[PDB]
Write a protein that binds this ligand. Structure first.
Ligand code: HEM
Ligand code: HEM
Ligand code: HEM
Ligand code: HEM
Lengths: 141, 146, 141, 146
């Protein structure tokens, strides 16, 4: 469970993301494609080349949902319900890939918020991503 | 593989008593029932709405014998799973888009099927050697992903 | 999330186990140690040899907790509070390991309850060990 | 360990820039902070009660530097990590009783630490190289477990 401390940390770090969420979401995807190629099997239909607008468009979408879970940090299961349904019923991404993206998301933030990416912040953001992932995978079976 | 001759002989010997038809149909179906999300690859098979409809589906039963078929042959090249599965590894990546993690799900399922079947015969030590084989196969199968 | 069919399936399967839960606890431990030797790092003070009384006793203990869990399947978080604690603050077993013992438990059940280990029951027991895993690692951080 | 020539040059070029005393201390502290359960091995290190107490613990700092020292040496023998790392693998197994999963947790943390420090320099493609590297080492460190 996220503590008050965690919640403050996340709101604050995501807070600085601001207007870069989109680009940071794209970057995290690309990192994930390059380091864990199996993840690519879910995007056969995408142009995965560097600067792909498809990727661009998609990272914005992922970032917007993270942004909505931060906005609803106290009711994530309900704010992400719909995305949780999509993933479980249509996309059916194996659960292990959630951990892969979270990881590239943390690398991305680390690379862009040196000043905010503190140990305490790092810990909270990891816990958070883990909670998002848990929600999005909750109705798998 | 990094199998002990003793481990090689245990794998080899149990395999000998295996009905690939029945075991392959059962491994893949259990797969589709325990981990519902792997059905994403088999939409064309029909009705997989229930355990029963999964276990009964002939396309499933038949895909299962094709898979275990191939697995079975890999057991004869236990010293080079890599080269045995290179072509199948590219296929799965480049044509089928199957996430390599599925290779691991199946293996665990296979081991549960073998225990199921062989009861007593499927001892901790015997299980230990099959775990090494499933892992190796999954690894060889994922080897060519890019 | 355990459905009512799941709970039934679980209470059913485990009902069959009966007076053997202890032996099955011990057998499951024994298959984990052999198959995933990294798991042994958590038991340096034990005699991990086959038929070891340390292993047997411990097997009983785990089995007993599982029982209590089947009995409070509607209230796990509460039935296993203490255990969740011990694990999070004393033992501190890495979470990856819960999945290894769970698998060795299916494998053990499968080999012993041929008639009962049907596909639907396999699916349920899996979900169940997973839920128990989740509870036991919920207070880790 | 499939390090392409260009992947090896990239690993090595960046590692050229690292202050191992520093990176060593940051990676280990962060490990104890993000995955507090890993604190199980360091009860002799004193106060690890809060982020500051860990990150600043002279003992954590000293151990991190040691750990990363062994790791940099690993980086000069990318060729033979298994051999490079064998007495260490045995020690961690047999003496320290350290779950191998710990080696993969640190790798990931280390990767976050490197991104933290190099910023934009830790390109997507440089991360993928390092990802291969930390896995190779984790594997090498677990090779002697039994
Ligand atoms: C915390 C992690 C994740 C978040 C927040 C997230 C969120 C989203 C969102 C908002 C969409 C678009 C749905 C729409 O059309 O409105 C989406 C689609 C999708 N996601 Fe997820 N997702 C996550 C994890 C993953 C992972 C790990 C994978 C696989 C590696 C994945 C694979 C997909 C795919 C294949 C689509 C459909 C894309 C398309 O066809 O345009 N997702 N996700
Ligand atoms: C033990 C691991 C596996 C082996 C040895 C294996 C082997 C095979 C073989 C021999 C084929 C025949 C196709 C051809 O030659 O054109 C095949 C096809 C296929 N496999 Fe795999 N497979 C394995 C695991 C999986 C898993 C776990 C999945 C998904 C859950 C999967 C999905 C498929 C699909 C969708 C096809 C195409 C069948 C068709 O054309 O309808 N495989 N596999
Ligand atoms: C299905 C999940 C698990 C259950 C229900 C479970 C249950 C238990 C129980 C009931 C105890 C005894 C408490 C007491 O002494 O009063 C225990 C202790 C312990 N468990 Fe867990 N356990 C689980 C998973 C694990 C795993 C996966 C590991 C590591 C591989 C582990 C490591 C330990 C250790 C090292 C002890 C202490 C043994 C001793 O010193 O006697 N547990 N566990
Ligand atoms: C890159 C991975 C690692 C490397 C290269 C490494 C290297 C080392 C070295 C060189 C030593 C000292 C050898 C000696 O005492 O004779 C050591 C000791 C130790 N390592 Fe590792 N290590 C690694 C990962 C880890 C992790 C992740 C943990 C725990 C989470 C760990 C736990 C320990 C402990 C507890 C000691 C002994 C400390 C003491 O003196 O009390 N190591 N390691």
């Amino acid at each position: 469970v996220l503590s008050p401390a965690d919640k403050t940390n996340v709101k604050a770090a995501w807070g600085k993301v601001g207007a870069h969420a989109g680009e940071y979401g794209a970057e995290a995807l690309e990192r994930m494609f390059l380091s864990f190629p199996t993840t690519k099997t879910y995007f056969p239909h995408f142009d995965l080349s560097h600067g792909s607008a498809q990727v661009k468009g998609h990272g914005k979408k992922v970032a917007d949902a993270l942004t909505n879970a931060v906005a609803h940090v106290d009711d994530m299961p309900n704010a992400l319900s719909a995305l949780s349904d999509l993933h479980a019923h249509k996309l059916r991404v194996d659960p292990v890939n959630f951990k892969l993206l979270s990881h590239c998301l943390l690398v991305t933030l680390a690379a862009h918020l040196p000043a905010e990416f503190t140990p305490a912040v790092h810990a909270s953001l990891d816990k958070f991503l883990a909670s998002v992932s848990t929600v999005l995978t909750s109705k798998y079976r | 593989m990094h199998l002990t001759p003793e481990e090689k002989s245990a794998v080899t010997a149990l395999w000998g008593k295996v009905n690939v038809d029945e075991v392959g149909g059962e491994a893949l179906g259990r797969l589709l029932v325990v981990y519902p999300w792997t059905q994403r690859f088999f939409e064309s098979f029909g009705d997989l709405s229930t355990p029963d409809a999964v276990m009964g589906n002939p396309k499933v039963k038949a895909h299962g014998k094709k898979v275990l078929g191939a697995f079975s042959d890999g057991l004869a090249h236990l010293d080079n799973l890599k080269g045995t599965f290179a072509t199948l590894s590219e296929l799965h990546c480049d044509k089928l888009h199957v996430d390599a993690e599925n290779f691991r799900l199946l293996g665990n399922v296979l081991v549960c099927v073998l225990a199921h079947h062989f009861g007593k015969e499927f001892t901790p030590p015997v299980q230990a050697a099959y775990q090494k084989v499933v892992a190796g196969v999954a690894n060889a199968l994922a080897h060519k992903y890019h």
